[PDB]
Structures are given as C-alpha cells and as structure tokens.
Ligand binder design. Structure first.
Ligand SMILES: NCCCCCC(=O)N[C@H]1Cc2ccccc2/C1=C\c1ccc2c(c1C(=O)O)OCO2
Ligand SMILES: NCCCCCC(=O)N[C@H]1Cc2ccccc2/C1=C\c1ccc2c(c1C(=O)O)OCO2
Ligand SMILES: [Cl-]
Ligand SMILES: [Cl-]
Lengths: 146, 146
C-alpha cells in the first residue's frame, strides 16, 4: 500500500496532463505533455520513482501497459507494472473526481500563468497542500512503512 | 531544518543541470535546462514546492536571488528566498562533492540513455536510493516535524 501509484491521463487546451496518484494518500505529481506516448510515460515514471518509493504502478491504459519503453523504465526503476482495471468500481469515480477537481483549480489559477504547465504545477501545489493534507499523509504513510 | 533546501547549478554536455538539495537529508531533485534563467529557476521551484514542504531556499547565485520571476515564484509558493553564501565553509565542499558524485553516476548510466535528461533522472534515482538512504532520511525528518 505505501508503494502503490495509479497513472491518470486527462486532457485540457488540446494538451495532455499526465498524473500519478499515490493511492493511499491522494498525493499527486503531474506534467503537461504534447501527447501520451510510451516515451513520455516512461520518462515520467523514471522521474517519479527517483523521488518516491514506487513499488507498483497501475497503468492508465493498455497502450502504456503494452509499451516496451514503459516496460523498460519499470524494469530499470524496480517498478511492478500492473493494469489499472477498476476491479473495485469506486476507483473510476475517484479518478474522475480528481480530474474534475484538478481542472477546477487550473481554471482558478489559469490567469496567473502564461503557460498551462505552470498552472498545472500550481494545481499540484494547491492539491497536495489542501487540508491532514495529502502531502502530510504520504510522508506519514511512508515513514510508518520504513 | 526540515524545510531548508539549497539550489545548485552544474554544467555537462553544453547543458545546465539544476539541482535542489534537501540540506538535512541529502535528498535531491534535478532537471536539465538549456541555460539557467530566472524563468527556468522559478518554474523548477514551483514544481519542488508542490511536491515537498519547502520553507526556505538558499539560492545558488545573485542573479537568481535578484530575479523578479524567482521572487514571484517564491512569493506564490510561500518560500523564504535566502542567499546561498557559505557562511559555514564546509558547504562549498559538500556541494562540490555532490556535483562530482552526480557527474560520476551520469557517466556510469550515460550509455543506457539516448538523452542527457534521462541519465540525469537515473542519477537522481541512484543518489536518493543509495544506502539509511537520502529518500528515507527526508521522509523521516519531515514525518517527525509533522
Ligand atoms: N495571463 C497573464 C500571465 C502573466 C504572467 C504572470 C506571471 O509572471 N506569473 C508568474 C507567477 C508564477 C508563480 C510560480 C511560478 C511561475 C510563475 C509565473 C510565471 C512563469 C514563470 C516561469 C515559467 C512560466 C511562467 C508562466 O507565466 O507560466 O512558464 C514556464 O516557466
Ligand atoms: N546508447 C544509447 C542507448 C539507447 C537508449 C536505450 C534505452 O532504450 N534506454 C531506456 C532505458 C530507460 C530507463 C528509464 C527511462 C527511460 C529509459 C530509456 C529510454 C528513454 C525513454 C524515454 C525518454 C528518453 C529515453 C532515453 O533513451 O533517453 O529520453 C526522454 O524520454
Ligand atoms: Cl507538500
Ligand atoms: Cl526514494
């Protein structure tokens, strides 16, 4: 549980927002990319795994699950790559709710930033600090595990 | 102490590697940028502060300390922007040692990656996982503070 992350891909302004959610805490990292490719996903996962102890990733779709580049990154970083099938159906709705929430925050900050990527990082900040906070929960969870 | 970070800028392959070090743990985040500008530094700090509880940043030079864009980002993210003058002289040497270590790791992985940015993120991963590890220390420090 402390090492479980879920990938999530959402769209805004003709661009793609790639999100990793730490399932147990709701803590997120996110980036804007031109389109979701195996290459982009692989690089994103490498970044994530260097920063937090990522044991398992539930991939966001079958293309990323199949991607040899994503598989290479998961091998390199010691990540167990799994499907993201919502066997528990309240998963769908929670990811949906998070995308809606993130887009709302992005709209609330959008005019403070020239570029979407900046607004997305502002949204990450607000989400992870919002009150415990998600940032507090992830640290506590991992510390307890260690 | 749990909230103190130090910026560090080093060079490789005609490119710039921007590093943030969590002083109490040795944990790092890093990115490759074409050149160190206020814009790049500001964006990097926004990303960092959304991901960890960044209270104080010791800036890497006077240009970034002066930059209105960096000041704007620090204001936005609630970061106290400070100078990075090594009042304690063992700071210089520790940062110097870290840059040497990072470049060594980059060389050890460089052939596994087409692009420098990938090698740098591999180096971040190896550095933060190397055995406690820096990743374990930062989590414990912050958890104790919370
Ligand atoms: N629509 C009006 C926009 C006017 C811009 C106002 C303004 O200075 N924003 C600051 C606030 C702020 C808070 C935190 C971080 C950046 C920024 C800002 C700019 C900025 C800086 C670097 C970047 C950026 C942008 C960006 O602006 O996105 O993009 C990638 O690297
Ligand atoms: N001697 C040359 C080696 C040829 C490449 C070998 C190879 O497949 N590396 C994997 C291993 C690996 C481990 C972790 C993450 C990426 C990669 C790799 C590629 C890669 C993927 C996405 C990217 C990249 C690269 C990149 O290659 O940098 O760049 C930005 O997004
Ligand atoms: Cl946080
Ligand atoms: Cl780690």
């Amino acid at each position: 549980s402390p090492g479980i992350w879920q990938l999530d891909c959402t769209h805004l302004e003709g661009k793609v927002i790639l999100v990793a959610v730490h399932v147990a805490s709701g803590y997120i990292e996110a980036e804007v990319i031109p389109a979701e490719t195996g290459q982009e996903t692989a690089y994103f996962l490498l970044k994530l795994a260097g920063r937090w102890p990522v044991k398992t990733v539930h991939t966001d779709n079958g293309s990323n699950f199949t991607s040899t580049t994503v598989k290479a990154a998961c091998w390199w970083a010691g990540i167990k790559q799994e499907d993201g099938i919502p066997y528990n159906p309240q998963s769908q709705g929670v990811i949906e709710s998070m995308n809606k929430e993130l887009k709302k925050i992005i709209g609330q900050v959008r005019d403070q930033a020239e570029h979407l990527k900046t607004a997305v990082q502002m949204a990450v900040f607000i989400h992870n600090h919002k009150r415990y906070s998600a940032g507090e929960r992830i640290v506590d969870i991992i510390a307890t595990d260690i």
